[PDB]
Design a protein around this motif. Structure first.
Motif, PDB file in Angstrom:
ATOM      1  N   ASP A 111       1.481   5.456  -2.185  1.00 24.06           N
ATOM      2  CA  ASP A 111       1.409   6.288  -1.000  1.00 24.06           C
ATOM      3  C   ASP A 111       0.517   5.619   0.040  1.00 24.06           C
ATOM      4  OD1 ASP A 111       2.583   8.749  -0.118  1.00 24.06           O
ATOM      5  OD2 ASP A 111       0.556   9.576   0.036  1.00 24.06           O
ATOM      6  N   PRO A 112       0.926   5.602   1.307  1.00 26.33           N
ATOM      7  CA  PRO A 112       0.099   4.955   2.338  1.00 26.33           C
ATOM      8  C   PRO A 112      -1.235   5.641   2.595  1.00 26.33           C
ATOM      9  CG  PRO A 112       1.934   6.128   3.317  1.00 26.33           C
ATOM     10  CD  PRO A 112       2.177   6.133   1.856  1.00 26.33           C
ATOM     11  N   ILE A 113      -1.397   6.906   2.209  1.00 26.17           N
ATOM     12  CA  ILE A 113      -2.633   7.630   2.482  1.00 26.17           C
ATOM     13  C   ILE A 113      -3.530   7.620   1.251  1.00 26.17           C
ATOM     14  CG2 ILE A 113      -3.635   9.901   2.937  1.00 26.17           C
ATOM     15  CD1 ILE A 113      -1.675  10.440   4.974  1.00 26.17           C
ATOM     16  N   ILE A 122       3.674   6.177  -6.699  1.00 28.66           N
ATOM     17  CA  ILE A 122       4.702   7.186  -6.494  1.00 28.66           C
ATOM     18  C   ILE A 122       5.983   6.706  -7.162  1.00 28.66           C
ATOM     19  CG2 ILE A 122       3.673   7.829  -4.266  1.00 28.66           C
ATOM     20  CD1 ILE A 122       6.262   6.615  -3.001  1.00 28.66           C
ATOM     21  N   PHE A 138       5.335  12.435  -6.720  1.00 30.78           N
ATOM     22  CA  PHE A 138       3.958  12.062  -6.450  1.00 30.78           C
ATOM     23  C   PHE A 138       3.093  12.463  -7.631  1.00 30.78           C
ATOM     24  CE2 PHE A 138       6.033  13.014  -2.429  1.00 30.78           C
ATOM     25  CZ  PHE A 138       5.875  11.807  -1.776  1.00 30.78           C
TER      26      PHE A 138
END
Lengths: 505, 110, 219, 130, 297, 219
Positions: free
Chosen positions: B39-41, B46, B102
Motif C-alpha cells: 500500500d502506498p500509505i 496487499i 488488505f
C-alpha cells in the motif's frame, strides 16, 4: 443585391438573383444596341456588370446613350430604389489610335481612361435634386417589411412570409431557371427593363407566348427559333441545405460542414489595359488582341467551369469575368478550386494567377454571412502578395503552388497514410501535434523536446510491426517542425484537413 | 428476477509466505531483496484483486473449458459470463467483482 | 414551490481508483495509463460525468421495467432525474453532478505520502507459451478523499415525486458503494465509500430532517 | 554562476543525452524503469511547487537528492564482462547533483524539474527504452 | 466644434441592416437617438430638444481615434491634378484599389492625402460573428456580428461643450451604443479632450469654399442645388424599426436617404431634425442630419 | 432619481466551463467541441447573452408564479429587468449585461499553466453491446476568473419596485452559484462562484450600503 438574403430559401433566391442580374446586364446591352439599330457584333465584352461597345461617333449616338441611361436609371429607381445603379461611359477615338503600325501605348490606354473617368464621376454623383427629393418624401406608415431584402414597396403575403414584388418575381423565377429559354414580354416576369419583363418559359410553351426577344442558355446549336445565345456557369449538384450532410461518405466519415469559395483573377483590369504592352515596345496594344483576351476569359469562366465542376457536390452560383462564387461540400470545394487554378495556370501559360478564399461553415448558415466571411478570406489571400489561397481563416494563407505541391498532395497524403494505420487512441495525438505547432513561439526549444517525446509515444502505442511503419512519422514530422515557420503552418493545415476528413459525429 | 448483489466475504490466511511482487525502483533504501506490492500509505503488503482474478480464471480454465483456450477470450460461456470477455458482446461485463485485499490482523501480529 | 437541495459527502477510495485520461495529453513521465487530473494542481479528480454515467447504468438495472437499449429508453423515474434529449418533458433532468476534487491533500502529506498517484504493475500470462507481458497503470492513492456534491431541484411538478427521487438517489449511492467507480474495477479498482452523507437545502424552504436521518441510517 | 538558466537547460539536456554511454549494439544502458521513481518525485515536486511555499518543500528536495544519489549508486548493469552505472553516469554527465544544491526558491525548483523533463524527452528521442 | 469626445469601446454591434452585420463606426443619427432616449428616460427631454433646436448644437459621425483623431476619406478627390504619374498601369490600379479600400486617414496627413500620397488602413477593430441559440425552441440559431476593437483604438465625435451633453454622454457610457446592448455590446468609457490646434481651425460651418462633411447630413431643400451641381457624395439609407414605448407593435420608420461622410461640396448647408415617424403615430421619430464641415486646401 | 448601479464581481470557475462557440467562428478549432473565445487575445470569455439567458431561465422557475411557453408570457418581474418585445412598457429592461473577459491570465501564467483551456476526454458506453465511443470537450481551466459587471438603471416613476428588483438580482446571482453556467453542467461543468460581489452607484446618487451588506450576507 445577390448576397443579401436573410431567411430560409436563400439558395433558390441566390441563384435566381445571380441569373437575373446577368440577364439584366445582357438586356441592357441588347436594348442599347437595338435603340441605335446595331446588334451584338458591336458588343466587345459583357459580364460582371461591365460592358464595352464600339459605336459611331455621332451626336445622335451620344443623345441616345444619355436618354437610355436616364430611362434605365429611372427604371432602377422605381424597381430597386438605390440598390442598383447603372453608369454610362464614352470616349472619342480615331482609327489610327488602334492600328498597331500607327498607334502608341498611352493613347490606347487613354481611350479606355476617358470612359473610365467619366463613369467614375457619374458614379460619385448619382442622383439630381428632383430624384433625391422624390426619394426623401417619406410619408409612408408601414408596420411590416420584406423578410429577404427588407423592402417596403409592394408587400405581399406568400407562404406565410412577406415578400416584395421583386422578391416574389425572383421566387417565381427560381423554378424557371431549370429551363433553357427565357423570353422578354411587356408585363409578365421579373421587370428587367422599361416596359420589359424577363420570363423563363419552357420550349413547348414558347409558341403560346408573346415576346420581343428570346435568350437560350448554354447551347451552341442553332435551334429552330431565332434566339440570342448566352453562356453562364450554372452547375448544380444538389440543394444547398443538403451540402452540409453530403460531406459525409458512405462510411459516415467526414465533418458535417459546407464550404464557400470565392476566387478572383489577379489584376484582370491591368491585364486588359496593358497586359500585352510589355512585348514589342507596346506594338501589341490594339483592340483585337484585348478583346480576344476577353473572349478567352469568357469561354474559360462561363462555359469551362461547368466542366471543371463535373461530378462534384457543389453549385457555381456566380461565374462571370473574374469573380467566381461556388458553394458545396468542403472536400469537393477544395478539389474544385485546386483543379480550376491548375487548369487556369495551364490555360494562360502561367502569366495570370488567381486568389482564393475557402470558408467553412455549419448547416443553415445565412448566405450573406458566408459570402462576407469568404470575401474577407479572399481579400486576405490577395494581401499575401496575391497568387494565394486562404483556407477557413486568414492565418493559413499560402501561395497557391505551395498549398498544392506541399500541403494538399504532399503532407496531407503523408498523414492520411500513417494515420489510417493508428487507432482512435493514437489518432488523438493529431490534436497534440496541432497544439505544439500552435505553441512553438512559447518555449521554442522545450516545445521541440515535447515533440520528440510525444512522437516516440505514438510509435509505441501502435501495433507490433505496424509500429515499424510509424517509425517514418517521427522522422518526418520532426523535420517539418524544425525547418522554419512555413512548413509548420503547412503541417498544421494538413493536420486540420485530415482531422476534418476522419471526423465521426 | 429482481437485481441483487451478493458479497462473498472471507479472510485469506496465508499458510506460507506470500510474494506477489512490485517494482525494484519502489523498494526500501538499502534493500537488495525482491519487493512485494505494498500500500502506498501504510506500506503494508496487499493482495491485489487482479492477482486473485487471474489465478482463479487460470485455475478454472482447466475445469470448465472443454477445449484448451488459446487466449482468455476463448473461454467457455460460464467463465466468460463470470470473469468477462472483451470479444463477446453478451459477456463484456462479467458478474464478478474482485477486490484488493488488505492486511486485517496487524494488531494481532503486533 | 421551487427549492434546491445539496447532497454532500466525501468519496473515500477503499482501493486505487483509475478513471483514465488520454495517453496523448499526458505528462512527460514513463509508460502509464494516466488518470484524469486537474490542469492547475495536477491532482486526480473524479469527473461528474463518470459518477452520472455509473449511477444511471446501475439504476437502469433496478428501476427499468424493460431493458433499455439506449438512455433515451430509460423509464420516467430515471429520465426525470438524469434527463432525456428525446423527451419534451424531461429535457432538463433535475440532478446536477459536480466534479469531485481532492480534499485531504494536507492529511495525505501529514501521513508522509510523496505522490498522490501510485503506479501499479501487472502482467498477463499466455495460456500456452506462458510468457508474462508486463504493464503498469496509474491509480489514485487508496485513502484519498474527494468532495462530492449533488444538487437536486424541486419544482411544481416534482412535489409528488420528491420521496421517490430521494429513494432512487439513496439506491444509486448504495449501488455505487457496492460497485466500482470507472476503471478496471472487476480486478479490484474503484471501490468507494460516501462519508458524512448529508443533505442541506441550499435554496428555498424544505425539510430534509427525515431525509438526513435516512441518509445516516442507510447510506 | 548558475549552471541551469532559462536559456540553456534544454541544450544542456541534449548534450548530456548525446554523451550518455551505450552498449556494443548502440542501445542505451539506461532505462526509464531505472529512473521511474526519480521522475515521479520530480513531477510531484513540480506540481506542489505551484501552490505551496518553498519552506515546506525543503524536505522533499532533500529526499529527492537522497533518491538521486541512491539510484546512482544502486543501478548497475553487467554486459560483456564489464559493469556500468547508468543512473550514476546520467547524473554525472547531466550535472544533476550540484544542480540540486542551487535550488533555493520556486523558480530554481521549477527550472530543475523542466530540465529533468527535457532530459527524459531527449533520452526517449534517442532510442531510450522503457 | 468645441470638444473632442472620446468613447473607448470593448465590444459593440452597429447593425447596417441585419443582426449579423456590424459596421466599424456608427452614424450621428444613432447617437442622437441614443441621447434622445437617455434624456426621455431621465425626464429632461424638453431641455435637450430645445438645445437641439439651436444652431449652436453640432454633431458628427464617430471616427476612429488612435493617438489622434481620424477623418473619413473625402469622396470625390482622387483627382489627377496631384496624382499624375508615369508609372505602369499595374501600380496605378494597385494604388486605386488601396485608396478605394481606405476609409479613414490620420488628421496629421489628411492634406497629405490631397497631395497625391497613398496611405493604407490601420488595424482598428476585428468584426467577428457569434452564433447563439434558444434552448427551448430548437429552431432559432441566430448570428450576431461584433466590432471588437484593439490597439487602444476608440471612437470620437466633435460636439459643443454643454453640461447637459456631458451628463448625457456619462449616462450613455453605462447604457451602451447600438445593437444588443443588454447582451454585452455597445458599452464604452468616455473621455473629454481638447480639439488640437491643427483641427479646430478647420472645423467650419458657414462659407463658400470646398467643405468635406463630417456628418451623415441631408441638406435643406433650399440649397440642395449647390450640392447637386458641384457636390461629390455617397447615398446612405436610414431605414429601420422605430423604437417606441407607446405601441405594442413595431412600426417601420420612413426610409430616408442622406449624404455620407466625408462628402465634399463647394458650400455649406443647413441640416434637418427630420420627422421620420409613420403616420398616426403618437410621438415623433427624430432623424438627425446636421453637418459639421472640414476645410480643404 | 436617475442613477445606475453596477454589480461588479470576479466569476471564479470551480469546475471546467464549456460555453461553446461555432467551429469556424471562434477560430478553426481541431477539437470537436471548442469553447467561445476572444477574437484577438484568444482567451475564453463568458458572453453577456449567456449570463442573461441563464439568469432569466433560473428566475423563471421562481419569480413566475405560473408557466410560460415563450419568453413573452413572463412575469412582470422578469419583463421589467430583461425586457419583453411584445409589451409596450417593457420593450427594453433595466439590466445591461456585459461580456466577462479573462482577468487573471497573469496569475495563471505565474502558477505555471501553458493553456487557458483544456481537453476533457469522455466516452459513452452502449447499453447493449457495451462498446465505448470516445468524445472530447474543451473547457476553461478551473481557477480562471472573469470580470463580471452588470448594470441596473434607476429612473423616475420606477423607485417603487427597486427594493423588489434588488432581491430579484440577488436571487438570480445566488441561483447562478447554485446551478451551472452554460454547458454540460449536469455532468460537472460550469460551476461558478462570485467574488467581491459589491454594487456601486456610478451615475447619479443612491444608497447602496444596505444593498452592499446584503450582497455579502444573502449572496
Amino acid at each position: 443585391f445577390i448576397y443579401n438574403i436573410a431567411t430560409s430559401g436563400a439558395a433558390k433566391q441566390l441563384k435566381a438573383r445571380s441569373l437575373y442580374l446577368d440577364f439584366m446586364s445582357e438586356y441592357i446591352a441588347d436594348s442599347l444596341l437595338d435603340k441605335l439599330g446595331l446588334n451584338r457584333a458591336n458588343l466587345l465584352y459583357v459580364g460582371g456588370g461591365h460592358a464595352y461597345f464600339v459605336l459611331a461617333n455621332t451626336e445622335k449616338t451620344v443623345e441616345t446613350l444619355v436618354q437610355f441611361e436616364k430611362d434605365f436609371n429611372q427604371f432602377l429607381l422605381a424597381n430597386f430604389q438605390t440598390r442598383l445603379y447603372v453608369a454610362f461611359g464614352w470616349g472619342s477615338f480615331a482609327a489610327k489610335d488602334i492600328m498597331s503600325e500607327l498607334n502608341s501605348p498611352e493613347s490606347y490606354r487613354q481611350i479606355y481612361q476617358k470612359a473610365s473617368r467619366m463613369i467614375s464621376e457619374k458614379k460619385i454623383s448619382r442622383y439630381d435634386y428632383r430624384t433625391l427629393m422624390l426619394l426623401n418624401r417619406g410619408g409612408k406608415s408601414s408596420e411590416r417589411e420584406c423578410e429577404i431584402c427588407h423592402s417596403v414597396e409592394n408587400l405581399v403575403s406568400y407562404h406565410d412570409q412577406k415578400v416584395c414584388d421583386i422578391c416574389r418575381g425572383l421566387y417565381q423565377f427560381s423554378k424557371e431557371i431549370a429551363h433553357d429559354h427565357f423570353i422578354i414580354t411587356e408585363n409578365e416576369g421579373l421587370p428587367i427593363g422599361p416596359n420589359a419583363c424577363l420570363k423563363g418559359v419552357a420550349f413547348e410553351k414558347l409558341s403560346q407566348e408573346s415576346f420581343s426577344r428570346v435568350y437560350v442558355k448554354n447551347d451552341y446549336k442553332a435551334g429552330t427559333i431565332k434566339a440570342t445565345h448566352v453562356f453562364v456557369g450554372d452547375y448544380q449538384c444538389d440543394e444547398i441545405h443538403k451540402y452540409a450532410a453530403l460531406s459525409k461518405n458512405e462510411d459516415g466519415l467526414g465533418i458535417k460542414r459546407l464550404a464557400v469559395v470565392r476566387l478572383d483573377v489577379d489584376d484582370l483590369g491591368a491585364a486588359f489595359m496593358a497586359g500585352f504592352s510589355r512585348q514589342g515596345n507596346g506594338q501589341y496594344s490594339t483592340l483585337s488582341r484585348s478583346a480576344t483576351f476577353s473572349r478567352s476569359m469568357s469561354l474559360f469562366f462561363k462555359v469551362y467551369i461547368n466542366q471543371f465542376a463535373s461530378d462534384k457536390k457543389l453549385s457555381i452560383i456566380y461565374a462571370g469575368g473574374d469573380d467566381v462564387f461556388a458553394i458545396g461540400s468542403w472536400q469537393d470545394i477544395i478539389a474544385f478550386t485546386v483543379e480550376l487554378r491548375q487548369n487556369f495556370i495551364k490555360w494562360t501559360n502561367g502569366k495570370l494567377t488567381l486568389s482564393a478564399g475557402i470558408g467553412l461553415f455549419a448547416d443553415k448558415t445565412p448566405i450573406s454571412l458566408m459570402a462576407h466571411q469568404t470575401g474577407e478570406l479572399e481579400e486576405a489571400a490577395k494581401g499575401n502578395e496575391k497568387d494565394s489561397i486562404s483556407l477557413f481563416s486568414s492565418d493559413y494563407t499560402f501561395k497557391f503552388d505551395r498549398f498544392i505541391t506541399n500541403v494538399y498532395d504532399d503532407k496531407l497524403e503523408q498523414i492520411r497514410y500513417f494515420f489510417n494505420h493508428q487507432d482512435e487512441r493514437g489518432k488523438n495525438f493529431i490534436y497534440k501535434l496541432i497544439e505544439l505547432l500552435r505553441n512553438y513561439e512559447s518555449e521554442e526549444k522545450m516545445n521541440v523536446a515535447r515533440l520528440a517525446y510525444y512522437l516516440t509515444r505514438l510509435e509505441e502505442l501502435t501495433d507490433k510491426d505496424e509500429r515499424d511503419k510509424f517509425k517514418q512519422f517521427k522522422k518526418l514530422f520532426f523535420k517539418w517542425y524544425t525547418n522554419n515557420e512555413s512548413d509548420r503552418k503547412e503541417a498544421e493545415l494538413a493536420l486540420l484537413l485530415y482531422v476534418y476528413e476522419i471526423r465521426k459525429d | 428476477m429482481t437485481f441483487a448483489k451478493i458479497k462473498f466475504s472471507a479472510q485469506i490466511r496465508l499458510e506460507t509466505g506470500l510474494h506477489i511482487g512490485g517494482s525494484d525502483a519502489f523498494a526500501a533504501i538499502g534493500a537488495i531483496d525482491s519487493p512485494v506490492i505494498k500500500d502506498p500509505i501504510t506500506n503494508l503488503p496487499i493482495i491485489p484483486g487482479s492477482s486473485l482474478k487471474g489465478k482463479m480464471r487460470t485455475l478454472l480454465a482447466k475445469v470448465y473449458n472443454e477445449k484448451v483456450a488459446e487466449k482468455p477470450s476463448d473461454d467457455s460461456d460460464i467463465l466468460s459470463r463470470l470473469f468477462g470477455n472483451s470479444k463477446d458482446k453478451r459477456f463484456k461485463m462479467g458478474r464478478l467483482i474482485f477486490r484488493d485485499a488488505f492486511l486485517s490482523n496487524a494488531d494481532e501480529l503486533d | 414551490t421551487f427549492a434546491k437541495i445539496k447532497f454532500s459527502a466525501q468519496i473515500r477510495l477503499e482501493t486505487g481508483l483509475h478513471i483514465g485520461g488520454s495517453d496523448a495529453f499526458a505528462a512527460i513521465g514513463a509508460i502509464d495509463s494516466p488518470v484524469i487530473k486537474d490542469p492547475i494542481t495536477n491532482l486526480p479528480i473524479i469527473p461528474g460525468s463518470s459518477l452520472k454515467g455509473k449511477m444511471r447504468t446501475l439504476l437502469a438495472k433496478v428501476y427499468n421495467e424493460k431493458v433499455a437499449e439506449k438512455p433515451s429508453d430509460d423509464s420516467d423515474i430515471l429520465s426525470r432525474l438524469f434527463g432525456n434529449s428525446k423527451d419534451k418533458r424531461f429535457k432538463m433532468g433535475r440532478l446536477i453532478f459536480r466534479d469531485a476534487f481532492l480534499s485531504n491533500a494536507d492529511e495525505l502529506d501529514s501521513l508522509g505520502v510523496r505522490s498522490y498517484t501510485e503506479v501499479k504493475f501487472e502482467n498477463t500470462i499466455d495460456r500456452i507459451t506462458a510468457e508474462a507481458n508486463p504493464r503498469q497503470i496509474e491509480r489514485a492513492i487508496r485513502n484519498s478523499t474527494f468532495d462530492f456534491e449533488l444538487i437536486y431541484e424541486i419544482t411544481d411538478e416534482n412535489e409528488n415525486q420528491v420521496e421517490e427521487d430521494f429513494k432512487v438517489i439513496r439506491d444509486g449511492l448504495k449501488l455505487l458503494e457496492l460497485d466500482y467507480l470507472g476503471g478496471s474495477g472487476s480486478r479490484g479498482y474503484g471501490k468507494v465509500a460516501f462519508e458524512n452523507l448529508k443533505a442541506t437545502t441550499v435554496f428555498g424552504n424544505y425539510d430534509v430532517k427525515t431525509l438526513n436521518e435516512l441518509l445516516t441510517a442507510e447510506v | 554562476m548558475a549552471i541551469l538558466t532559462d536559456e540553456n537547460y534544454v541544450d544542456k539536456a541534449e548534450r548530456a543525452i548525446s554523451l550518455l554511454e551505450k552498449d556494443n549494439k548502440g542501445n542505451y544502458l539506461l532505462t526509464t524503469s531505472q529512473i521511474r521513481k526519480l521522475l515521479s518525485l520530480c513531477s510531484s515536486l513540480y506540481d506542489r511547487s505551484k501552490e505551496r511555499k518553498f519552506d515546506e518543500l525543503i524536505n522533499d528536495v532533500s529526499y529527492l537528492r537522497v533518491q538521486f544519489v541512491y539510484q546512482s549508486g544502486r543501478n548497475s548493469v553487467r554486459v560483456n564482462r564489464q559493469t556500468f552505472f547508468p543512473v550514476k553516469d546520467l547524473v554525472e554527465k547531466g550535472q544533476i547533483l550540484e544542480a540540486l544544491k542551487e535550488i533555493k526558491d520556486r523558480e530554481t525548483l521549477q527550472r530543475f524539474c523542466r530540465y529533468m523533463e527535457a532530459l527524459v524527452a531527449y533520452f526517449k528521442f534517442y532510442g531510450g527504452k522503457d | 466644434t468645441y470638444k473632442l469626445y472620446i468613447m473607448t469601446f470593448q465590444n459593440a454591434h452597429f447593425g447596417s441592416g441585419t443582426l449579423d452585420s456590424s459596421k466599424l463606426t456608427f452614424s450621428a443619427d444613432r447617437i442622437f437617438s441614443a441621447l434622445v432616449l437617455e434624456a426621455l428616460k431621465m425626464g429632461k427631454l424638453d431641455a435637450f430638444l430645445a438645445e437641439a433646436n439651436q444652431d449652436k448644437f453640432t454633431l458628427t459621425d464617430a471616427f476612429p481615434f488612435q493617438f489622434g483623431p481620424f477623418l473619413p476619406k473625402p469622396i470625390g478627390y482622387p483627382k489627377h491634378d496631384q496624382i499624375d504619374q508615369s508609372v505602369d498601369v499595374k501600380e496605378v490600379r494597385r494604388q486605386a484599389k488601396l485608396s478605394k479600400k481606405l476609409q479613414f486617414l490620420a488628421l496629421e496627413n489628411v492634406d497629405d492625402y490631397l497631395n497625391g500620397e497613398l496611405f493604407e488602413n490601420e488595424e482598428h477593430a476585428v468584426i467577428d460573428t457569434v452564433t447563439k441559440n434558444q434552448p427551448h425552441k430548437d429552431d432559432n440559431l441566430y448570428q450576431v456580428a461584433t466590432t471588437r476593437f484593439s490597439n487602444d483604438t476608440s471612437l470620437y465625435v466633435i460636439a459643443n461643450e454643454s453640461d447637459l451633453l456631458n451628463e448625457l454622454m456619462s449616462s450613455l457610457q453605462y447604457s451602451g451604443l447600438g445593437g444588443k446592448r443588454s447582451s454585452g455590446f455597445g458599452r464604452f468609457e468616455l473621455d473629454i479632450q481638447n480639439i488640437p490646434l491643427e483641427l479646430s481651425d478647420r472645423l467650419t460651418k458657414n462659407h463658400s469654399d470646398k467643405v468635406m462633411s463630417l456628418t451623415t447630413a441631408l441638406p435643406v431643400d433650399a440649397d440642395l442645388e449647390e450640392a447637386m451641381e458641384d457636390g461629390h457624395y455617397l447615398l446612405t439609407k436610414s431605414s429601420g424599426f422605430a423604437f417606441s414605448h407607446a405601441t405594442n407593435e413595431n412600426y417601420r420608420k420612413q426610409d430616408l436617404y442622406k449624404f455620407a461622410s466625408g462628402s465634399t461640396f463647394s458650400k455649406t448647408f443647413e441640416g434637418q431634425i427630420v420627422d421620420v415617424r409613420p403616420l398616426d403615430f403618437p410621438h415623433a421619430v427624430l432623424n438627425y442630419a446636421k453637418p459639421l464641415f472640414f476645410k480643404l486646401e
